[PDB]
Amino acid sequence: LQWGHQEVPAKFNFASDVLDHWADMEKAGKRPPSPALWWVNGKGKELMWNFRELSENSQQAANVLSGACGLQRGDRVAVVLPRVPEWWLVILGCIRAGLIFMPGTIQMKSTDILYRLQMSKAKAIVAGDEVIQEVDTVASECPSLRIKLLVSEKSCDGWLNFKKLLNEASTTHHCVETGSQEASAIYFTSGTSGLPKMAEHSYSSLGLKAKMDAGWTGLQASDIMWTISDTGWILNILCSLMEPWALGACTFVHLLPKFDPLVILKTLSSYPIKSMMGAPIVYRMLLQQDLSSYKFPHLQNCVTVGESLLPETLENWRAQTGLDIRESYGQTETGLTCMVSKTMKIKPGYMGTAASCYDVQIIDDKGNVLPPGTEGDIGIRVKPIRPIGIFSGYVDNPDKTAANIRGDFWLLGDRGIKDEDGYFQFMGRADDIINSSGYRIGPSEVENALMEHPAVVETAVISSPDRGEVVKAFVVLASQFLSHDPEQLTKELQQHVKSVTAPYKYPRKIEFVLNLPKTVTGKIQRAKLRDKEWK
Ligand SMILES: Nc1ncnc2c1ncn2[C@@H]1O[C@H](COP(=O)(O)CP(=O)(O)OP(=O)(O)O)[C@@H](O)[C@H]1O
Ligand SMILES: [Cl-]
Ligand SMILES: [Cl-]
Ligand SMILES: [Cl-]
Ligand SMILES: [Mg+2]
Ligand SMILES: [Mg+2]
Numbered sequence: 134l135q136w137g138h139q140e141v142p143a144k145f146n147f148a149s150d151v152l153d154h155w156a157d158m159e160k161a162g163k164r165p166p167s168p169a170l171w172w173v174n175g176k177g178k179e180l181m182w183n184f185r186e187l188s189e190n191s192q193q194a195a196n197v198l199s200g201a202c203g204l205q206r207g208d209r210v211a212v213v214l215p216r217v218p219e220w221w222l223v224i225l226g227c228i229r230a231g232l233i234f235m236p237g238t239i240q241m242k243s244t245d246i247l248y249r250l251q252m253s254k255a256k257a258i259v260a261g262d263e264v265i266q267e268v269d270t271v272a273s274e275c276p277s278l279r280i281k282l283l284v285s286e287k288s289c290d291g292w293l294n295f296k297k298l299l300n301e302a303s304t305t306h307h308c309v310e311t312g313s314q315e316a317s318a319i320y321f322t323s324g325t326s327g328l329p330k331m332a333e334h335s336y337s338s339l340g341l342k343a344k345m346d347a348g349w350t351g352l353q354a355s356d357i358m359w360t361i362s363d364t365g366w367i368l369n370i371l372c373s374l375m376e377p378w379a380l381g382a383c384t385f386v387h388l389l390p391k392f393d394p395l396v397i398l399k400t401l402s403s404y405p406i407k408s409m410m411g412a413p414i415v416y417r418m419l420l421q422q423d424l425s426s427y428k429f430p431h432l433q434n435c436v437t438v439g440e441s442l443l444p445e446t447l448e449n450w451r452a453q454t455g456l457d458i459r460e461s462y463g464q465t466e467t468g469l470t471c472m473v474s475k476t477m478k479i480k481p482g483y484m485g486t487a488a489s490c491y492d493v494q495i496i497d498d499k500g501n502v503l504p505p506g507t508e509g510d511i512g513i514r515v516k517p518i519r520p521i522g523i524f525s526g527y528v529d530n531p532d533k534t535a536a537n538i539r540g541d542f543w544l545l546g547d548r549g550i551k552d553e554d555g556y557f558q559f560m561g562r563a564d565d566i567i568n569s570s571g572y573r574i575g576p577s578e579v580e581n582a583l584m585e586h587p588a589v590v591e592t593a594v595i596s597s598p599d600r601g602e603v604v605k606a607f608v609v610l611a612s613q614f615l616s617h618d619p620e621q622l623t624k625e626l627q628q629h630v631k632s633v634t635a636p637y638k639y640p641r642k643i644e645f646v647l648n649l650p651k652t653v654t655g656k657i658q659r660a661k662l663r664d665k666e667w668k
Contacts, residue, residue, distance in 0.1 A: 214260065325656045331529065472486070494551070514541050577594075579594040595659050
């Protein structure tokens with residue numbers, strides 16, 4: 134890879150360097166025993182660890198992984214757990230013992246579990262009892278897999294008993310003196326644009342970056358943050374674990390087994406949660422609940438990431454709660470990239486300014502920095518100095534990593550515009566923009582236009598070969614419209630878009646379909662549709 138060099142300490146480890154500072158303050162009486170992790174299941178069980186208990190209990194976890202499981206420094210460990218405290222303990226265990234943690238969603242099918250296990254050559258899997266049947270259907274096809282570690286109230290033959298081993302383990306573990314650029318995590322990307330990519334992160338690219346970013350949410354040392362996230366995604370490590378614990382703040386975890394928005398509302402209203410992080414969908418769902426009946430005067434900080442925060446959602450939330458939602462932007466490869474900080478003015482439709490380690494710019498085809506107000510590719514300067522926070526590269530695929538470097542910049546693959554104050558506005562995934570008859574057409578606008586029509590339940594807008602190409606809509610019809618003549622309905626839909634947007638943006642092709650392809654997270658796979666359209 135030719136992408137600069139870093140200015141980092143030789144060694145870094147979040148457990149030893151950040152977390153164990155807080156444990157030591159408590160132990161030296163320099164700080165009172167302060168809550169670190171507060172977990173509830175929504176059924177009347179709660180558990181809380183202070184910083185000393187977290188440190189002792191996660192040292193036990195490192196002992197289990199390194200001792201009982203025989204795992205050696207650099208060994209790769211898949212972690213497929215729901216929102217249970219053992220996820221936080223196991224990840225910390227991995228960090229202490231110098232093991233590469235590889236989190237995945239419990240929402241995975243057995244074919245996804247096979248793909249990840251095989252692709253990553255995982256030596257271990259840590260799972261809960263609701264995924265062990267799926268794991269065991271495919272585990273024999275995974276020749277690198279040596280250890281199956283189960284987190285459960287029950288035992289299963291073939292699986293080591295985490296909870297029992299944890300309790301037998303010493304609360305003293307000698308934390309590995311891990312290198313700042315040594316591999317700490319592998320995150321599989323969610324698969325929006327294609328097969329999941331294996332994104333390697335270092336001890337510093339996660340923990341030092343998080344340390345440097347600490348407090349961007351508005352969180353402070355005496356506060357409680359609720360990050361609402363699947364444990365399988367990078368959001369969970371960066372905001373659920375690292376942000377609060379860099380600050381000595383408490384992280385709040387609700388099992389939330391059904392992701393029920395009324396449960397989220399009740400939780401916010403019943404617990405002294407000062408800050409929350411969730412995808413835009415969380416706020417949208419909350420706005421459809423009865424916010425007159427469930428007040429949360431304690432809540433101060435509302436942040437979001439993952440997709441565009443609609444000005445409409447921002448404005449309704451403000452009206453209904455008196456709070457701002459502060460948007461952030463990034464990707465698995467880069468972590469927190471742009472954000473609206475606690476002190477910054479909120480500009481609806483904009484996702485903030487560069488995160489501190491980063492020179493984020495809009496760049497042209499040659500890698501040159503563009504003036505404000507010009508649409509281009511969003512990029513992070515990586516030469517001559519690669520900033521702390523950027524990942525280590527795609528596992529096994531250095532060609533792929535190199536292919537995203539343009540001149541001095543890492544390409545995010547997203548289009549944007551930067552305003553006069555340096556705020557970014559997201560302008561779509563670069564590969565999804567349609568070029569027809571010398572026009573550039575973004576799919577979101579066409580999709581939104583289509584969705585206004587009562588006939589349309591869901592839609593994806595993609596390029597199709599023609600005039601170079603043409604705008605095509607895939608449309609899932611409302612049941613009552615399936616009986617309509619499709620030629621006539623196509624014309625009616627084409628005419629409708631032509632009336633809400635620039636007429637050069639209308640879908641010249643419309644295909645009616647019964648479902649759209651989506652990732653495990655529900656993101657429409659436009660690439661997949663596009664690939665098939667071009668054949
Ligand atoms: N505030 C925001 N506004 C609009 N889009 C956002 C955003 N924050 C993140 N994103 C989108 O989410 C992407 C990062 O998502 P990731 O979690 O890294 C997996 P993905 O890129 O969807 O899958 P893939 O890499 O497997 O194709 C960004 O590159 C961007 O397109
Ligand atoms: Cl320290
Ligand atoms: Cl729930
Ligand atoms: Cl929204
Ligand atoms: Mg991506
Ligand atoms: Mg509709």
